[PDB]
Amino acid sequence: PRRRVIGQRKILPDPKFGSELLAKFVNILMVDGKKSTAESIVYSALETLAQRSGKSELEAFEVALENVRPTVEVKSRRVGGSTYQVPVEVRPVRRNALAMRWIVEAARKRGDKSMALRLANELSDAAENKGTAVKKREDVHRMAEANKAFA
Amino acid sequence: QRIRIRLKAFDHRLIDQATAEIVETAKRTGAQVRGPIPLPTRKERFTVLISPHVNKDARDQYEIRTHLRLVDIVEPTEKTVDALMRLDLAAGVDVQISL
Amino acid sequence: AKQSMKAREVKRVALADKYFAKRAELKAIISDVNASDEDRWNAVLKLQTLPRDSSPSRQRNRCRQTGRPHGFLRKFGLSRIKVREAAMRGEIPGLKKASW
Amino acid sequence: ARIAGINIPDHKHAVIALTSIYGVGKTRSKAILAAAGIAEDVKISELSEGQIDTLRDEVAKFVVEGDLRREISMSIKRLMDLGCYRGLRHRRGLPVRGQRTKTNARTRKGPRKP
Amino acid sequence: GQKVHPNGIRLGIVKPWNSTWFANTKEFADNLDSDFKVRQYLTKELAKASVSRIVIERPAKSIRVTIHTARPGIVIGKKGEDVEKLRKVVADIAGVPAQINIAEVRKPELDAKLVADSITSQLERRVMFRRAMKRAVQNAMRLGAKGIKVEVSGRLGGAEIARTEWYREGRVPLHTLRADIDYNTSEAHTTYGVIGVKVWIFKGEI
Amino acid sequence: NQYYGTGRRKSSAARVFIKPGNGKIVINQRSLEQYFGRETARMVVRQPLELVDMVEKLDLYITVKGGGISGQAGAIRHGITRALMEYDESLRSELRKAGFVTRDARQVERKKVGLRKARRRPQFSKR
Amino acid sequence: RSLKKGPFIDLHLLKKVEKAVESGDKKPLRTWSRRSTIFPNMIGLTIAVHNGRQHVPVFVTDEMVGHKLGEFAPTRTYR
RNA sequence: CGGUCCGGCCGGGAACUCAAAGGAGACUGCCAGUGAUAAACUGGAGGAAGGUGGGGAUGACGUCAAGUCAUCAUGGCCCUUACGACCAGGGCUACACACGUGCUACAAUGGCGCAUACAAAGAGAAGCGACCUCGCGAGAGCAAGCGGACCUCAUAAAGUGCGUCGUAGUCCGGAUUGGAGUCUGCAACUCGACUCCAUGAAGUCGGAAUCGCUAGUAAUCGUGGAUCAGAAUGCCACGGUG
Ligand SMILES: [Mg+2]
Ligand SMILES: [Mg+2]
Ligand SMILES: [Mg+2]
Ligand SMILES: [Mg+2]
Ligand SMILES: [Mg+2]
Ligand SMILES: [Mg+2]
Ligand SMILES: [Mg+2]
Ligand SMILES: [Mg+2]
Question: Which of E77, E106, E135 represents a domain boundary (last residue)?
């Protein structure tokens, strides 16, 4: 990325609802190149989330995602021997990618019986904004408002 | 019955040139000629250490390609059998006669 | 390798075809027949009296020019160094540097 | 529940409950339930006293618990008094089966000290 | 750094093999040792006979040795006097019957092995290495070589600190596989050690 | 006469035959559902029969050798599209836009000497 | 450890065990045969088994039967 | 298409998959924007492929008196009834420790049981060794085919379907050790691999610090080979998912 200016790989949509955003989500959850078992966990979590939150499977994901989605983040920069944290406005594409990544990571750090149950209860916590994933957006916010002078 | 000729050689532009001789000699002296059938090449690969001592990642990778040709001659005419028997083929080509 | 080490191999080949190729194989197949002699054979005892170097398993594959006991390749009867040297001179037929 | 060697097997499935006995692993537990005519996927609940004693009589055939413990200890002590390589290694608390001691022999040696 | 053998890398591209016979895994090792043993005999015997290349092919159960030489008269002898004595012992070494062919090397100053052996035999006569190299380069260039490179390594002139010295004239494109590069080695066994001679001769592309 | 199209991906090779009438799919003398246990692999072969309409319009006799689940399913997808252009040729424009005409040239990279895998370099140690 | 088809014993040592029974117990039997299996006809004898440098004398007991002679002769000195 | 033991299996068919020899094709060639009307870059069309399309081989003059006199060769030096040579047993496998490279884990994206779909690339006559039979098994006996697109190694495993365990040092994990064996080999004590039964360590995700990898890559999952009587978690190579 020094000289070469690359774009972004367009991935195939979700085989269930035709959503490109869900295809990014299944891939983020995916481990050891096991896509079959990765979408199985995402769909079982969405089936248990929509049923226990009042249908709208795509919309129930979006409510949980709107709360974890960050607006600003810090960028590490060493000017004169000292490391300054410069607050930078995150692009809409990465806004969703960070939101999805923290949901998967917070569900992995849970103590529930299954990953489908861990994911569903993490999306339920995010929809009401009271979990590990929403606190990661909260910590990122406190870090940005602090270094607001070096913007 | 049928005369099966199996040809083996390490050089490709020598096996199908010696095969061209067998096919032309048999079809000219009047015989039914099936093939030249190009059977799969057996690639024996060899990886050797390039340094006399130590330097494990530094290596030489070689291969020996064993080319296979099948020439089936249906008609065993005396004019064909005698013409193929007194044929001068490339010294580096192995010929297998199957009755 | 040493001249004596090369000589030790010649002795190991000479003894291998003398005994363990036409005589010791007959008493080893005999020490395996369940149908005949289950206690009184002495074949396991008479295999010991035969020279040690007569066993083919006692022979070591060495570079046919240098005598090197390591880096041997059965296809050429040579070690990796002498395989490369002959390969580069075009002395190994059909052999060239491969890529895929 | 109480089978042979004083131990009290839990209210889990029959095959895993029988493995609690020292001297009965996966194979013995499967063979014991097959000879007594009891299912492997059945719990201790419903398994009446008439089904427990028939398993107790079945498990009594092989040396288990304290009876097996002294049998293993006697064979270790036999090698030790014998003065063999195997016995000298049980006496020196080092790997008996031939394993390397230059590095990695921590199971037999115990945790390291500087 | 380290360079790829110029002859080895060009095998199949623009350079031919010195052994063209076919054999299975069974007799391949036995044939290769027999090839070494026949080359060893002939190189020793025809050392003064300017042998540049030896080609060995095996037609069925026979051996066909093609001795490339700049001096065919000394190799052949008095109406086949020397060919007969060589064939008789080549047949003994190989086991199978022998046939010896003699290929003439026209311009030996354009043959890498004959240039390398010439520099080597000169170094052993106590000739100056720079003179031996300059003459090899000049002779090849005047006879139509598109380029030439001659290297001499180790204890040059009997010096305690060994040096690697080289003379180059013309074009020597070692990276072009299409390029006819004739490369060969020779070792000068001097009173102060071994001096290695490496010769590269560019003859044109295709 | 049968409308034919060859399709391939990775080490897989699929042959596709088109005959009008019905919505039948026979893969290696087996059903579409019987052969592929994954619904994602079932949908990619249904993809060429979306832009170009078919419910009960044409039948397909297919056979595939080599590769794996997505390799075989990807190979058939390319074959149907080649058998569809064999039938009309004006369907090219719709097939290009979706990216089904393109043979996916992505093959597994060779293991290299001194490397653990094709690119995975063994762990470096400074001291 | 070995196939049940005959335990192993060296002929030179086997004949030395036979000569020690009929002629009566002598001084330690000097043998390098560490590979030989201990037979019941050895119980009571003193077999001087090599360790690489010296011949370790071992008094053969009933429990030593089946084991190898080299098990009672330590090869490496560790202190 | 004709005939069915429903097996390409047999007549046949040379269509297709494939095999392997020859040939075409991609050059910023076309269009548009940017750019000194240049080089070039960016985007688009067509195209299987687009800007060295992917991967490899290929390593300039030289640098480090860098590595190798133990592959071999070789100047000088040194031993030459010994620094040579033969043999048996031992050692290279020792074990208070320290570091480097790996394998297997700590589990439900998982363990186990049954059922089941899809590879690629190799090896083979002093060899690969089917089927049948015996043994829980490693194996053993008997014995076809095949110097091989024919026969054999050889059932790919991940995956999918159903059932079970239900966050527990556990139906996780397998170390260690006891008992009994299998095979190769004159010979498995030191010091082989594998099986059966029993045992069930540490480990519940690793401090400071640190490594690889930019796409069919990483990650994960099996498969083969060289060496080799036997002895792979190493190395070399192969495809699956991704
Ligand atoms: Mg010597
Ligand atoms: Mg050996
Ligand atoms: Mg137990
Ligand atoms: Mg081609
Ligand atoms: Mg280049
Ligand atoms: Mg130095
Ligand atoms: Mg387990
Ligand atoms: Mg890169």
Answer: E106
Task: Tokens for E168, please give them.
Answer: 């180059």
**In contact, E57 and B91? CB cutoff 8 Å:** yes
Distance, in Å, from the CA atom of F103 to the CA atom of F106, rounded to the nearest integer, reads 9
Q: What is the CATH number of the domain that holds E162?
A: 3.30.1140.32
Q: Is the dihedral of CA E140, E142, E146, E148 positive or negative?
A: positive
Q: Is F109 helix (H, G, I), strand (E, B) or coil?
A: coil
Strands (E), G1-79: 29-31, 46-50, 55-59
What is the C-alpha separation between B79 and B74, in angstroms, rounded? 13
Q: Using DSSP, state whether E184 is helix, strand or coil.
A: strand
Are E123 and E99 contained in the same domain? no
Calculate ∠ Cα E136-E138-E141, nearest 5°.
105
Residue E55 lies in a domain: yes
| C32 contacts on G by Cβ (under 8 Å) | 5
Chain C residues bordering chain E (beta-carbon distance below 8 Å): 64-65, 74-78, 86-94, 96-97
- Residues A117, A82: contact at Cβ < 8 Å? no
**Residue D33 in contact with residue D18, Cβ under 8 Å?**
yes
Same-domain status, E26 and E120: no
Residue E117 sits in the same domain as residue E190: yes
Judge whether E180 and E167 are in contact, CB under 8 Å. Answer: no
Same domain flag for E24 and E83: yes
Number of structural domains in chain E? 2
H helices of chain A, in order, are: 20-29, 35-51, 57-68, 92-108, 115-127, 132-146
Does residue E1 form part of some domain?
A: no
Local structure of residue C73 (DSSP, 8 states): E
The dihedral sign for the CA sequence D95, D98, D103, D107? negative
Query: Which chain H nucleotides are covered by protein, judged by CB under 7 A?
Result: 15-22, 42-43, 46-49, 53-63, 65, 67-76, 84-102, 108-110, 117-126, 140-141, 147-149, 156-161, 163-167, 170-171, 175-179, 181-193, 196-201, 210-221, 226-229, 235-242
**Cβ–Cβ under 8 Å, residues E55 and E65:** yes
What are the residue ranges spanned by the domains of chain C?
A: 1-90
E78 with E137, same domain: the answer is no
Q: How far is F117 from chain A (nearest CA, A)?
A: 16
Alpha helices, H only, F39-118: 39-46, 48-51, 69-87, 92-98
Q: Retrieve residue A22's tokens.
A: 């869900």
E142 and E71 fall within a common domain: no
- Of E106, E123, E156, the residue at which a domain comes to its end is E106
**Residue B20: exposed, middle, or buried by beta-carbon count in 10 A (0-12, 13-18, 19+)?**
exposed
CA angle E171, E175, E178 (to 5 degrees): 80
E99 and E115 inside one domain? no
C-alpha span between E71 and E73 (Å, rounded):
6
What is the per-residue DSSP string for G8-37? Answer: ---HHHHHHHHHHHHS---S-EEE---SPB
Report yes or no on E159 lying in a domain: yes
Sign of CA dihedral C38, C39, C40, C41: positive
- Give me the residue label for tokens 């003994």: E92
Q: Is E57 on the interface with B (CB under 8 A)?
A: yes
User: By C-alpha distance, which of B5, G33, A9, C84 is closest to E9?
Assistant: C84
Instruction: Give the count of beta carbons closer than 10 Å to the beta carbon of residue A62.
Output: 12
Query: What DSSP element (H or E) covers A78?
Result: strand A72-78
Residue E123's H or E segment, with its range, is helix E112-123
CATH of the domain at E89: 3.30.300.20
And the tokens for F116? 């653990």
CA F12 to chain centroid: 8
Helix or strand run (H / E) with residue B25: helix B12-28
- Beta-carbon contacts of D100 under 8 Å, excluding residues fewer than 6 positions away, are none
Range of the domain at E190: 107-206
Phi, psi (5° rounding) for residue C56? Answer: -70, -25
